[PDB]
Amino acid sequence: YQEPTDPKFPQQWYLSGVTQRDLNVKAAWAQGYTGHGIVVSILDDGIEKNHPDLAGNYDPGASFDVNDQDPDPQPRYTQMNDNRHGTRCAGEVAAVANNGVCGVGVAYNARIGGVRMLDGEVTDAVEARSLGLNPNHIHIYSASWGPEDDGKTVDGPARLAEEAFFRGVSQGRGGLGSIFVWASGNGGREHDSCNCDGYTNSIYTLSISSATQFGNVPWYSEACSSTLATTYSSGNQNEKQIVTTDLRQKCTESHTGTSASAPLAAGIIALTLEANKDLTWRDMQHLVVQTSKPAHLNANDWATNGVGRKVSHSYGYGLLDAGAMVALAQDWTTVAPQRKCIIDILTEPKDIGKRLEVRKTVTACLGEPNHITRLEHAQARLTLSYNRRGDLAIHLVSPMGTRSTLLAARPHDYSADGFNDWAFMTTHSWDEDPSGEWVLEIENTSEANNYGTLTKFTLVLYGTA
Ligand SMILES: [Ca+2]
Ligand SMILES: [Ca+2]
Ligand SMILES: [Ca+2]
Ligand SMILES: [Ca+2]
Numbered sequence: 001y002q003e004p005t006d007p008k009f010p011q012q013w014y015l016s017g018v019t020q021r022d023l024n025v026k027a028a029w030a031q032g033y034t035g036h037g038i039v040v041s042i043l044d045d046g047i048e049k050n051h052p053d054l055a056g057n058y059d060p061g062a063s064f065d066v067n068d069q070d071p072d073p074q075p076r077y078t079q080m081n082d083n084r085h086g087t088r089c090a091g092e093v094a095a096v097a098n099n100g101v102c103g104v105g106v107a108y109n110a111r112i113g114g115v116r117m118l119d120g121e122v123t124d125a126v127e128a129r130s131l132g133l134n135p136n137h138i139h140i141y142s143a144s145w146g147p148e149d150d151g152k153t154v155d156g157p158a159r160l161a162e163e164a165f166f167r168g169v170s171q172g173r174g175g176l177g178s179i180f181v182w183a184s185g186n187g188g189r190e191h192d193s194c195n196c197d198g199y200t201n202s203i204y205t206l207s208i209s210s211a212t213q214f215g216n217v218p219w220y221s222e223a224c225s226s227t228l229a230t231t232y233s234s235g236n237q238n239e240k241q242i243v244t245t246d247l248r249q250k251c252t253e254s255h256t257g258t259s260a261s262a263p264l265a266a267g268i269i270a271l272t273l274e275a276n277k278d279l280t281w282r283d284m285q286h287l288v289v290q291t292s293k294p295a296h297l298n299a300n301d302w303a304t305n306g307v308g309r310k311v312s313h314s315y316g317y318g319l320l321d322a323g324a325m326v327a328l329a330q331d332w333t334t335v336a337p338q339r340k341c342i343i344d345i346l347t348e349p350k351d352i353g354k355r356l357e358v359r360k361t362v363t364a365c366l367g368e369p370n371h372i373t374r375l376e377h378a379q380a381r382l383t384l385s386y387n388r389r390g391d392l393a394i395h396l397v398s399p400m401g402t403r404s405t406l407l408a409a410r411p412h413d414y415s416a417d418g419f420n421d422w423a424f425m426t427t428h429s430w431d432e433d434p435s436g437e438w439v440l441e442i443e444n445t446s447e448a449n450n451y452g453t454l455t456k457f458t459l460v461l462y463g464t465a
Contacts, residue, residue: 001030008103008251011243013213014232014264015106021215021296023231023264025106027323028271035107037277038270040093042263043130043143044086046075047114051087053245054112056096057105061137062113066129067120075247076119084247086114088255089142091245092263093270102251103243106267106322107274113138118145128160131180135172139273140179142266144259146199149187149222151412152390154422156198165204169281177281179269180205183262185222193408194224195424201226203377203425203462206285208265209315210258213239215296220257223301223313225396225404225426228285229292230315231264233257268322275329282335282376289430291325294318306400306432313405316427336464339372341365345440345457352386352452358440364461366435372463375434379423379460380406384442386452389415393443398429399436409445418452423460434461 003009003026009016015025028034041062049058049072063073075083094105094112105112117130122145131141147155157165165180172178182205184194194200200207207227212218212235219235234241234256242255242264272287273279279287294302294310297319302312311317345360365371380396390413394406404426440457444450 001032004097004104006097006103007100008243011253012103013240023268023319024321024323025268028326031326033271033274033326035094035110035267035270035274038107038110038140038273039138040107040110040112040140040142040266040270041133041138042086042089042114043117043141044089044114045083045118046086046116047073047090048075048087048247048249049073051245051249053095053099053102054090056099057094057110057112059111059113061134062111063115064133065116066126067116073114073116075116077247081247083119085259087247088244088252089259089263090114092242092260093142093267095245102245106264107270110270124158124160127157128164131161131164131168135168135178136174139173140181140266140269142181142263144183144262146185146197149185149190149192151187151190151192151410152415154196154419156201165202169204176278179281179284181262181266181269182207183258184209184224184227186220186257186259187222188218188220190412191410192222193410194222195226195406201423201425206288208262210261211297211315211319212236215298217299217314221314223408225313225406225428227313227316228427229265229288229317230297230319231261233260265320268320268325271322272325272329275326276332278334279329279332280334282338283332286335287325287328287332288320289317289427291321291328292317292319293321303403305402305428306398311428339370339463339465341370341372341461343459343461345459346454349453349455352384352442352454354444356442356454358457359437361437362435362459364434371465372461373433374464375429375432375461376463377425377427378429378434378462379425380440381421381423381456381458381460382419382454383421383456384452384454385418387416387450388448389413389418391444391446391448391450393445394424395441396426397439398432398434399438400432402429402432404428421456
């Protein structure tokens with residue numbers, strides 16, 4: 001093995017770095033893992049398959065055009081370069097190495113495809129078709145779509161896309177499960193809270209946020225409990241950005257935002273799957289939880305959970321660490337069957353007013369086939385009315401004492417629609433024992449005299465025994 005010779009590899013600071021402050025990818029490459037035999041697909045605005053840094057790894061089997069209903073995902077060219085995004089992301093995962101062009105992908109011997117699906121009317125059906133493309137050929141899908149990041153919207157996948165996620169993790173990859181890697185959002189300026197985005201807030205998506213070069217939470221970041229982990233992206237004008245393949249056969253040094261983080265995660269996950277091709281979609285999430293690193297990341301909300309792991313709403317479990325992922329993968333015992341324990345918490349509706357606390361001691365399906373002693377994801381499915389949605393903050397405390405923020409104040413959100421059986425998800429209690437007293441807190445963070453009612457609280461616990 002030799003370090004890549006590509007002309008912009010030194011500029012790929014999140015990989016080539018020798019300041020400790022990187023994704024630890026060289027360590028995986030040096031162990032011999034570069035993505036061989038793994039297939040990744042970018043679900044976005046298309047892919048420039050003839051790009052000099054992509055063509056060598058391009059895989060028609062991983063690509064389709066859902067907008068035009070044909071096999072060729074080539075993007076449309078416009079003056080504003082609207083359809084540059086998929087090509088940028090594809091390069092992050094799998095740009096060719098050692099070919100004197102631009103930089104390299106994290107998984108530079110992986111095969112890369114794209115689905116052209118954003119350049120047209122994006123319906124539920126379009127989404128489902130993209131998520132379900134060739135599920136026994138493609139291992140890993142990477143995407144960043146979701147509701148407008150205006151800090152006012154609550155929305156997620158409709159029925160067909162939800163069913164495709166489920167079919168994907170259930171039946172995809174010969175039963176091991178499609179790995180759906182997701183960006184958590186770019187609505188930071190608008191105080192958006194990513195549990196209001198049902199794509200990233202899903203248990204089926206392995207969700208990723210960003211850190212700046214100097215290890216800070218970028219302006220565009222959204223915090224939420226559903227995020228699992230972090231990769232580097234852009235920041236302020238003194239901090240470097242993402243260097244990758246661009247539209248028109250170019251090399252950009254200015255790829256930005258959380259949408260640039262998901263593809264780096266996708267690449268790391270490809271290296272990890274190469275290291276253990278029998279990892280299931282849940283195994284992969286477990287690896288990310290166990291091996292991600294808080295160390296060099298600055299946040300004001302780091303907290304240690306019931307099993308001793310540091311976790312943040314901006315960063316999840318911290319920065320992905322490819323070396324550690326590959327290492328743990330090689331020793332990993334695949335997890336037991338997923339259990340789901342559904343607990344109806346409320347016996348009557350509760351007035352919210354200025355503040356509401358709901359406490360309930362649960363057995364987590366003790367005595368039954370869905371008894372859970374080792375949590376993975378938890379959801380609080382809430383139905384409530386409120387006069388000004390964004391003034392609410394909502395927290396969930398596990399019996400072991402871990403406080404998850406389910407919803408932070410979203411000052412721009414003046415909706416009077418409340419939440420209709422909305423599943424807020426947290427990863428922060430992973431591996432805890434969910435038996436005992438859970439506490440739900442709903443608070444009016446404004447000085448306004450606000451009012452509403454909580455009419456349903458379903459606690460949904462996932463995990464093993
Ligand atoms: Ca086409
Ligand atoms: Ca290259
Ligand atoms: Ca958002
Ligand atoms: Ca997710």
